[PDB]
Design a protein around this ligand. Structure first.
Ligand code: GDP
Ligand code: MG
Length: 181
């Protein structure tokens, strides 16, 4: 009989008018757009700034989530960096079933971390698609992304099933708490 709250109300408690800018990144198919629509927090808008490169965005009050795929795509790395401007947090999403592409994801993740503009970011990892038989454990995704060895930044790896909205409250609550200090 008990019911979840709407993220709309959750965001009111968590951020409530505060200026927040998070970027949610990952390899294509990790589950990022799914997380966006599953939040139900406003319209998503897109800009395709090149014939290949493609960015999505959502804002609620003064919290903005900016979203793109990372990896392959020639190497459009400079076209991104504009979008890191005064970012508070990174959400990096991983397909926990895709054992093959995780080295790539760790590489990519590791490149975001080393970018100057990400020095002081809180880091949330969604180890997504945990519903799938034989996927990686959240620890195995932690290990692989090298989160043990980590700077002085606050980080957290969170199990998720994005298509059921599972894990999302937990990660976002961590993120919100972490960010207000
Ligand atoms: N089984 C499962 N499938 C998922 C999950 N999250 C996303 N997907 C599916 O993975 C595909 C890509 O998701 P999408 O959100 O477009 O990935 P994006 O490229 O990261 O934006 C879609 O078919 C989703 O339904 C999950 O947690 N479990
Ligand atoms: Mg997408």
């Amino acid at each position: 009989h008990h019911m979840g709250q709407a993220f709309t109300k959750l965001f009111d408690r968590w951020f409530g008018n505060r200026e927040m800018r998070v970027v949610m990144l990952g390899l294509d198919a990790a589950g990022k757009t799914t997380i966006l629509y599953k939040l139900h927090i406003g319209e998503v808008l897109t800009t395709v700034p090149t014939i290949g490169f493609n960015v999505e965005k959502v804002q609620y009050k003064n919290v903005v989530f900016t979203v793109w795929d990372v990896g392959g795509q020639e190497k459009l790395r400079p076209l991104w960096r504009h979008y890191f401007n005064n970012t508070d947090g990174l959400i990096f999403v991983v397909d926990s079933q895709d054992r093959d592409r995780i080295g790539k994801a760790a590489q990519e993740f590791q490149a975001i971390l080393q970018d100057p503009l990400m020095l002081h970011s809180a880091i949330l990892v969604f180890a997504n698609k945990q519903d799938m038989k034989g996927c990686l454990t959240p620890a195995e995704v932690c290990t692989a992304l090298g989160l043990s060895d980590m700077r002085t930044r606050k980080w957290h790896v969170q199990s998720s099933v994005a298509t059921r909205g599972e894990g999302l409250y937990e990660g976002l609550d961590w993120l919100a708490t972490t960010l207000k200090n």
